Design a binder for this molecule. Structure first.
Ligand SMILES: Nc1ncnc2c1ncn2[C@@H]1O[C@H](COP(=O)(O)OP(=O)(O)O)[C@@H](O)[C@H]1O
Lengths: 60, 242, 121
């Protein structure tokens, strides 16, 4: 689902974050890379293109 | 060393009495701070009848017992060496002092009988390097250093044994001895108390060590046979349990 | 600079493989590496016990065994041949690898100012 949100730029909501998964650390830090006309962020061992319309909302 | 003049009875009595006083001093109060060592010294001075040094304030812990049966201060045995300029603050170099020389004498005594000992003290404080200096001073005993961690297990000692020693068959039985002949191996444990205890308040490593030191050997798990230790002794060090 | 990418599924063997990789990158390559660590990247005390062994010895024997140990021997042999030192037995090359790591590897630990966490550490 995080992949789908990052691909299509769709807003995403998380209801439970008490069991944090540190995969969002590059996303929260906005560790973006501007290679060519592409905006990429590394997630684990795989690289993902960012869409500006994407936004995440963590909730407790 | 004196075939012409072996000691006479009176000199032997003097030497053994002074050495006995020194022995209570460095054994009963060997694991306490300086003030309590001095307290024990004062108490024994009040109680004993053996001749004692007339130092107004210097405790007898500072004084040894010479081979002539006389109280000689440890300061004389302390030399004044000058290290090379390029060797300043080097890990190898040790500068002798009162504590260093006294601990060297204690280590010599406790390694002559191969009784294991534990160097307990605060971090640093010259525990490890003093022990290494004492060990390198004696030529016959080589050194191996095993870093015990919170997850230390006896298989580490098994690995050390199979790395530096070898199992041989003897008329008495199978014997563990170092691969180097005529050599006494020292298994230094830098943190012997660091390994955690189980849920039943038992540390496997310390039990294994005490088993071999008191029974003179251990158990090989492959064929389940008594193994006799030869030319193997342990030396430990640790921070205070507190 | 090197950071370990830690996630919820970042188990012990993942970090073990990462530490094997950095040890290969430091000693076998003679390449100075800065090892970035944060307590957020830590998920259990096994991480810190292995770092404790590494820091106090310059290496951890647990990582390298079997075929991995043989690959390490090949890499350190070729590295020593490249630098100009000829060694054959395993122990001498292992000590040379340890020296290379202790001269090249640099481990840093970042922690928030928690006094209780400080004494726990
Ligand atoms: N007699 C001495 N000669 C030279 N250095 C000493 C002496 N006593 C203490 N030191 C210094 O104190 C430090 C002792 O640390 P060390 O004994 O290695 O700690 P630990 O015993 O916890 O491993 C050494 O760095 C050493 O330089």
């Amino acid at each position: 689902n995080l992949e789908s949100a990052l691909r299509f730029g769709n807003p995403l909501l998380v209801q439970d974050v008490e069991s944090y998964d540190p995969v969002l650390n590059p996303v929260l830090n906005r560790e973006v890379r501007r290679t060519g006309g592409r905006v990429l962020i590394t997630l684990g061992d795989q690289d993902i293109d960012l869409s500006p319309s994407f936004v995440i909302f963590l909730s407790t | 060393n004196h075939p012409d003049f072996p000691m006479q009875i009176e000199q032997l009595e003097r030497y053994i009495q002074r050495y006995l006083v020194y022995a209570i001093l460095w054994s009963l109060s060997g694991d306490s701070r300086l003030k309590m060592r001095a307290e024990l010294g004062e108490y024994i001075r009040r109680i004993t009848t053996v001749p004692l040094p007339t130092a107004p304030n210097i405790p007898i812990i500072d004084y040894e017992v010479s081979i002539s049966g006389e109280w000689s201060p440890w300061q004389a045995k302390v030399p004044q060496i000058e290290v090379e300029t390029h060797k300043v603050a080097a890990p190898d170099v040790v500068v002798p002092t009162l504590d260093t020389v006294r601990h060297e004498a204690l280590l010599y005594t406790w390694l002559a009988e191969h009784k294991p000992l534990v160097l307990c003290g605060p971090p640093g404080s010259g525990k490890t390097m003093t022990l290494f200096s004492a060990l390198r001073a004696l030529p016959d005993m080589e050194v191996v250093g095993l870093n015990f961690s919170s997850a230390t297990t006896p298989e580490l000692l098994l690995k050390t044994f199979d790395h530096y020693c070898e199992y041989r068959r003897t008329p008495n039985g199978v014997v563990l001895a170092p691969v180097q002949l005529g050599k006494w191996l020292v298994l230094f444990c830098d943190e012997i108390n660091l390994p955690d205890m189980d849920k039943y308040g038992t540390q496997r490593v310390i039990s294994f060590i005490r088993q071999m030191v008191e029974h003179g050997g251990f158990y090989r798990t492959s064929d389940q046979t008594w193994v006799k230790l030869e030319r193997i002794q342990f030396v430990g060090a640790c921070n205070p349990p507190t | 600079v090197y950071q370990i990418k830690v996630h919820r599924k970042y188990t012990g063997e993942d970090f073990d493989e990462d530490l094997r990789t950095v040890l290969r990158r430091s000693g076998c390559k003679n390449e100075k590496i800065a090892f970035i660590m944060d307590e957020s990247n830590v998920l259990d005390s096994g991480f810190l016990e292995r770092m404790n062994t590494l820091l106090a010895n310059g290496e951890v024997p647990g990582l390298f065994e079997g075929d991995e140990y043989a690959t390490l021997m090949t890499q350190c042999k070729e590295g020593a041949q490249k630098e100009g030192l000829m060694l054959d037995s395993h122990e001498e090359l292992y000590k040379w690898f340890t020296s290379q790591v202790i001269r090249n590897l640099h481990v840093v630990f970042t922690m928030n100012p928690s006094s209780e966490g400080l004494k726990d550490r």
